[model samples]
Target: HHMSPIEPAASAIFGPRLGLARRYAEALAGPGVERGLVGPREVGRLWDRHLLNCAVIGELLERGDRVVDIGSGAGLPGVPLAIARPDLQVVLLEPLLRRTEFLREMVTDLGVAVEIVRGRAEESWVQDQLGGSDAAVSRAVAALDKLTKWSMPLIRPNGRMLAIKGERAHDEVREHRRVMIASGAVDVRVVTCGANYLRPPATVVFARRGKQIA
Candidate 1:
């Protein structure tokens, strides 16, 4: 079942937008793979390893927060969260034209009110456009240190950077803890989302922007 049936928890998490979530899964299974944005192997576990896993992170977000998905290759947590939470203002920032093109089409096709910007998070112009965002999220984008560097500058003081990680979550946090702190993040720690619903839950390394950026 490359496109597995939507898990039971999907309805509750996505709430009124469950249908859109299914369509997103279908889109990812089809064009998302065809366009080389997502790997063929990922198609089968789209729900288990992708959509549900990403949306559950919304549990940590406040209502109406502006979220930027750095390197939103195939719009993992960004797309899913926008579909799951209507209150959020979601932006997908991609450096590649093709990926941004794909994101634009996805947003239009899905009819979701998300903005697709073509730029790297580290770019000064990109920062100027999206800086002061409420939060920044990434999945498989880069190492904790580099991710922190790219994300922290885009968020305002006290905002958060939520990086979806795996078993190495704690290890990465420990390894790059100091660098993140130096980069203006504080209270950096590992947190789990969707534990009540997802089988292994989602491991996230969450860091808060410090009151002052040095």
Candidate 2:
């Protein structure tokens, strides 16, 4: 499942736009790593470990949704999902200047159309320009409690949070159940996908909150 090029998954899902996704993957493994945007060793697992791993989350977003990616380093799920569906307004929110420059260049080179927000996620931050989205996405961002604090606000009322997590997704939800519910999350659970398509499958925590979407 972790073999061959990333085309199969990209093709099956994004079809004619697969080329865009491929280009982003190439950049991620190449200049993205050389310039320190991606880890040096991640080149070997670029497809399975990075690209495809992140792109699959595109399935969870609504077609016309305004999506924000918190701590969008190297544009993991952000770039990939934007490649898969350019219609959705994707905001890659990051705080650091160096990474912000890299992310800007990567999108320009790859022709991915995601808005870049060079700012941090805080209680009183990002409301003016970065808040009121339909959903917020994060990958390896933080624990459930912490992530909710940063990501949930980016979404509008009745919006959702899609976080790409590992096998411990359920464990994190279990540990932070109360905080999540108290934070206006009406429903929370770990969802699994790609059972027949991906090697280890996709595990993510889906949290839907009430009013106050970022």
Candidate 3:
């Protein structure tokens, strides 16, 4: 199978884990695209549009942060992140069984080593078992109001949530401003990743838990 040119460059942060990152991309474009995980058109723009776009979140992470991907349909940001940042313990939390199955197979096949949790983010079982993560991320999930309700709980009192919402980033923030403050988010703003690497750039909404980094 062929590989994306940007795969090597975008995933250079993976260091030794770059091999798994490459395999992750292949899995995403192959079965991931075919099984309705990723759109067929995304196969052509797999690198800049998807792979690197998500992998760049590593820039916002610390060396050993505990990260969770809520509603991780086909392991969007989770698989790439797990491969790109082995330093972080990444969890792929999905509500569906079929998605979890695919995620598990990808993790095993590519050896990405990310945890695949089959459950909803708001469920007590999932929350009890996987709460207080340092960071929580979501791509193509719910809107800001509902997204914060789900993600804020998993994050510790001082942890934060990053949502990759692109064009809807600012609009969501605007619409959910009071709700976000009422939800206990100290700081909420849209931020960009891969400015140097990605052409369209990755626009993400960063909602810090409080005035401090908990």
Candidate 4:
């Protein structure tokens, strides 16, 4: 069995408790192949690109951190993070029934305990239930400005929101400074991943609310 270099790197970082991650990757690959989520020849990229990209954020979280993934269409960082850190309670928030159904099935199949909320971020139900989470993570789902509006309220007074962004992450952070402040995130910083395996890499926009300006 010839495994790509990325596989070993992923396994090593994820340690021996990556059964759910691997299984979900397989399940995603199986159905995703036909749906274009994972191309036949791009399976390797799927693991390195998506799975590992999600798992690397585990470093930013602490034990027992309750995380909420808003607009988790297919559970990107949410599912992978949950799998990587079973100690963390992860909630997947998706409004669409179809996607939420898929997410539920995937979480159930992988035997990972996750709460799936069926509502939009702007709704009261999501706001009330999502409040008090230690951290909120969103990726490629909404613009930085809107994401802050959707996420910051869910976090505890001093909790954080880890927004995954691309090359324009810095720029987005700067552009969304006002919104972040208005949304209750008084402190914001961009933390770049140091892993060499990440392509184009990614940035984690870490923001904290209800804290003295530092």
Each candidate: RMSD to true structure? 1.1, 2.5, 2.5, 2.9
Per-residue lDDT of model 2, residues 135-180, tens digit only: 8998987888988877766777788899899898989999997888
lDDT (Cα, tens digit) per residue for candidate 3, span 1-214: 3564464466465667666766777888888877888787777777677777888887887788899999998887887788777788999999888788888888888766588888888898877878779999989999888888788778887787989989879999999977877766768999998787776678999987764322
Model 4 lDDT tens row, 1-214: 2223355667765667666667777777776565554457757665677778877787788899999998887787898888878899999999888778778878888788788998998888888988889999988888888998888778887888888886778999989888788778877888866366576665788888665332
Model 4 stretches astray by more than 4 angstroms? 1-5, 33-42, 194-200, 211-214
Global lDDT scores for all candidate models:
0.90, 0.79, 0.81, 0.79
Using all chains and alpha carbons, the TM-scores for the candidates as numbered come to 0.97, 0.92, 0.91, 0.89
Residue 92 displacement (Å), model 1: 0.4
What is the alpha-carbon lDDT of model 2 when measured against the actual structure? Answer: 0.79
Candidate 2 Cα outliers beyond 4 Å, as residue runs: 1-4, 212-214
Question: Which model scores highest in TM-score?
Answer: 1
Alpha carbon deviation, residue 208, candidate 2 (Å):
0.7
- Backbone clashes in candidate 2 total 5
